[PDB]
Structure 1
Amino acid sequence: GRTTRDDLINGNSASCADVIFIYARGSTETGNLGTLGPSIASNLESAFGKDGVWIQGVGGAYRATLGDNALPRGTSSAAIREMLGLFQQANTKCPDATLIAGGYSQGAALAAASIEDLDSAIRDKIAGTVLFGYTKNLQNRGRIPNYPADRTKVFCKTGDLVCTGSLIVAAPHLAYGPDARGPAPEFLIEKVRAVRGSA
């Protein structure tokens, strides 16, 4: 349960993972996974095996700055190109790996924006995306633009004001721990499984 994971970056083209998880933390959060990232990762690891999944937090140019929430897409252009780059590194290192993503708060705005901007064929490989305290939930009508609703799972609590057009942080915004341990990883595992196999 560590808050910094660089499995894709330190990933080996010759020992490719079969699932790659790219996750963006919320503003001011520790490491590159914050509070929720590790819970999803550990759960993904038991389902795919520790070598079945590369876990990658969005670090680098993503500084998870509080003021950046106030920008038009809910994060910086720099953060967006940092996460777009990670998706592309995944596509390049491991062209057969299934992709999954998520983010919390500014991270959810960051995930939504990067996926909106991604080449449609890399984006085709993202089996599922989870979003918590999605700061653009109202503005995007619960969707990630350019990305199918059935690949999208948004955890937006009742009384989480960021999910209803605000940037006020109320108590439900802080309560996503059990979603990150449970229904979120379950959704990701179940999207990946339904796209792999001989069928």
Structure 2
Amino acid sequence: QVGSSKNELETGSASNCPKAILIFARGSTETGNLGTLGAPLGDALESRYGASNVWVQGVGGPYDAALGDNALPRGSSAAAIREGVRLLNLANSKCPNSKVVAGGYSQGAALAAAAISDASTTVRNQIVGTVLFGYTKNQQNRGGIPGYPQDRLRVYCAVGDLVCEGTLIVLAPHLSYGDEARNEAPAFLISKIGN
């Protein structure tokens, strides 16, 4: 087995920008750059618009999804958060007229939150919608992304997912977001991108 990965923002032509670009950060120990939730989420967007009209991009490079990095400031390493910021800035520099949507699972939700907070006011305006699954900073950020408007966010925190409740206790409900990745989350992102 090889982890599910997509790198379409990095490989795409700047002369052929898509309607939408998804940047997604996986959860700790997951393989590839999309993990378990990123691939179904990108597939749902590509089913809606067509695969040529969405660029799906996972967060990799120095983001190694390491278990220890959940204990760091903001819930991931500074280098992993910087990698999110590099991809958001790449989306903006290559394809400024494309709609960006962001997502993350678990540590990846913390990475996504921090990288969106760190991005410019113009980049945040380009990110029309964000979905967080099992958000490890839900309690500490009071259900939001600092500096990002609530209408553009959905947080999926399962009943009994204690990572949403200021701990790092990972129980069965933390593994229950496959349906939101397939259904509610792409439906929400689609509403913000437009038809």
Q: What range describes the TM-score normalised by the shorter chain of this pair?
A: over 0.9
- 1:156 aligns with 157
For structure 2, the 5+ residue unaligned runs are none
Within 1, Cα distance between the matches of 2:116 and 2:143? Answer: 14
1:140 aligns with 2:150: no
Identity %: 60
Mapping of 1:115-194 within 5 angstroms? Answer: 115-193=116-194
- 2:64 aligns with 63
| Greater mean alpha carbon deviation, residues 44-53 or residues 105-114 | 44-53
Instruction: Write out per-residue CA displacement over residues 88-121 of structure 1, whole angstroms, 9 at most, x where no aligned residue.
Output: 0010111110010000000000000000110011
Deviating 4+ runs (over 3 angstroms): none
- 2:99 aligns with 98
Within 1, Cα distance between the matches of 2:182 and 2:104? Answer: 14
Name the amino acid aligned to 1:60.
G
Within 2, Cα distance between the matches of 1:155 and 1:33? Answer: 17
Within 2, Cα distance between the matches of 1:61 and 1:53? Answer: 24
How far residue 77 of structure 1 moved from its aligned partner, in angstroms, is 0.3
Could you say what secondary structure the match of 1:43 adopts? helix
Query: Higher helix fraction: Structure 1 or Structure 2?
Result: 2
Name the amino acid aligned to 2:145.
I
Task: Say what the alpha-carbon RMSD is for the aligned residues.
Answer: 0.9
Within 1, Cα distance between the matches of 2:18 and 2:141? Answer: 32
TM-score in terms of structure 2 length:
0.97
Within 2, Cα distance between the matches of 1:7 and 1:66? Answer: 27
What count of residue pairs does the alignment treat as equivalent? 193
- 2:23 aligns with 22
Within 1, Cα distance between the matches of 2:19 and 2:153? Answer: 20
Name the amino acid aligned to 1:10.
T
- 1:197 aligns with none
- 1:114 aligns with 115
Within 1, Cα distance between the matches of 2:19 and 2:61? Answer: 24
Within 1, Cα distance between the matches of 2:75 and 2:35? Answer: 18
How far residue 15 of structure 1 moved from its aligned partner, in angstroms, is 1.3
Could you say what secondary structure the match of 1:112 adopts? helix
Name the amino acid aligned to 1:171.
A
Name the amino acid aligned to 1:121.
T
How far residue 6 of structure 1 moved from its aligned partner, in angstroms, is 0.4
Instruction: Write out per-residue CA displacement over residues 124-181 of structure 1, whole angstroms, 9 at most, x where no aligned residue.
Output: 0111000000000000010000000110000001110100000010110011111111
Could you say what secondary structure the match of 1:134 adopts? coil
Within 2, Cα distance between the matches of 1:80 and 1:41? Answer: 21
Name the amino acid aligned to 2:109.
A
TM-score in terms of structure 1 length:
0.95
For structure 1, the 5+ residue unaligned runs are 195-199
